[PDB]
Amino acid sequence: SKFRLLENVNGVEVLTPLNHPPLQAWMPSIRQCVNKYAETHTGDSAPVKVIATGGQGNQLILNYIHTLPHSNENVTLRIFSEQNDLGSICK
Incomplete structure (x- = not known):
């Protein structure tokens, strides 16, 4: 239940469990998902x-x-590396 900070994306802490394997390769996808989610969940x-x-x-x-x-x-969401349209799943 201890988390490490991958990145702060516009005020949203992106976290993963301390010993979870590396996720750096997913950062562009995560940033897009957070960006789209933050567009609709404001204030x-x-x-x-x-x-x-x-x-x-x-x-x-x-x-x-x-x-x-x-x-x-x-929400819990599932995203793919290949499948696109993060805009639909992350809104």
Whole structure:
């Protein structure tokens, strides 16, 4: 339950478990997903953090975590390396 910070993307902490394998290769995809998600979840509804896991094959899991009063907006999403249209899945 201890997380390391991959990057802060416009106020959103992108985190992964401390000993999770490297995810640097997924950063451009993660940045696009966060960028698109942050377009629609603004103000007090902006996510506080996103937990990234998996990614050793062609699939990555992203868990967007909001403040407690906006936790009905929390989502787990699955993205592909090859399959595109991050704009549809991350909005």
